[PDB]
């Protein structure tokens, strides 16, 4: 296959099913602060834009800090255990794995939780480097992620690649120079925004159109 060097996957929403999780804390969260909880479509609509803007998005402001430490307990409490990855994506990593393209992920709820989650389901020593998120904090460390995860990956290949789902992969990849492939995993919400220079990027629907755009 002609594969490229280094494949950067997605390990928020493309690589598990976030959802599950995502909505057993979420409805937690929420409760604990006396707010109600849309249940149905708020699965798949909480999906795509980070979790602090999206219970931002939902209303909170004054007390989210309260509802973000008390869904961060009720994540790594039971959210570790309301997930899953059985489907293409199995066949899908090994398929990538034989054509000898080395793999990796720049995207994470938490490295330290990532590097759990990962080790749970086995397929963290599968990839060359697993980051996402170091820290919670301040300015636009959007471009960091795969920068520093690629100076730890070095030394830089010709070939790299993205795999995402969201408007926050693909400027990411592009702000480095790297090409990038969305999926369509779910639907979220803040899908449109203002400030939209980067309008071109392929879309996979399914996962064989995952194998045949990395060419494996």
Same mark, same amino acid.
């Given at each position: 296959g002609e594969s490229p060097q280094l494949v950067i996957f997605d390990l928020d929403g493309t690589l598990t099913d976030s959802a599950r999780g995502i909505v057993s804390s979420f409805r937690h969260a929420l409760n604990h602060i006396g707010a109600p909880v849309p249940e149905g479509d708020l699965a798949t609509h909480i999906v795509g834009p980070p979790m602090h803007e999206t219970l931002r998005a939902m209303g909170?402001? /004054?007390s989210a800090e309260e509802a973000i430490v008390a869904y961060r307990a009720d994540y790594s409490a039971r959210g570790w255990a309301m997930n899953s990855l059985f489907d293409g994506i199995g066949p899908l990593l090994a398929d990538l794995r034989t054509a000898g393209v080395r793999l990796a992920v720049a995207t994470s709820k938490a490295e330290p939780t990532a590097r759990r989650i990962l080790r749970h389901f086995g !397929? /963290?020593?599968?990839?060359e480097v697993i980051a996402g998120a170091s820290t919670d904090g301040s300015r636009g460390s959007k471009v960091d992620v795969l920068a520093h995860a690629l100076a730890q990956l070095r *030394?830089? *290949? /010709?070939r790299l690649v993205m795999v995402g789902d969201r408007s926050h992969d693909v400027d990411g990849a592009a702000a480095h120079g790297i090409d990038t492939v969305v999926v369509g995993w779910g639907y979220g919400?803040? #899908?449109? !925004? #203002?400030?939209?220079? @980067? @309008?071109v990027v392929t879309h996979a629907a399914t996962i064989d159109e995952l194998r045949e755009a990395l060419g494996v």
């Open positions: 909170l402001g /004054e !397929i /963290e020593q599968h990839f *030394p830089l *290949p /010709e919400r803040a #899908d449109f !925004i #203002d400030k939209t220079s @980067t @309008t």
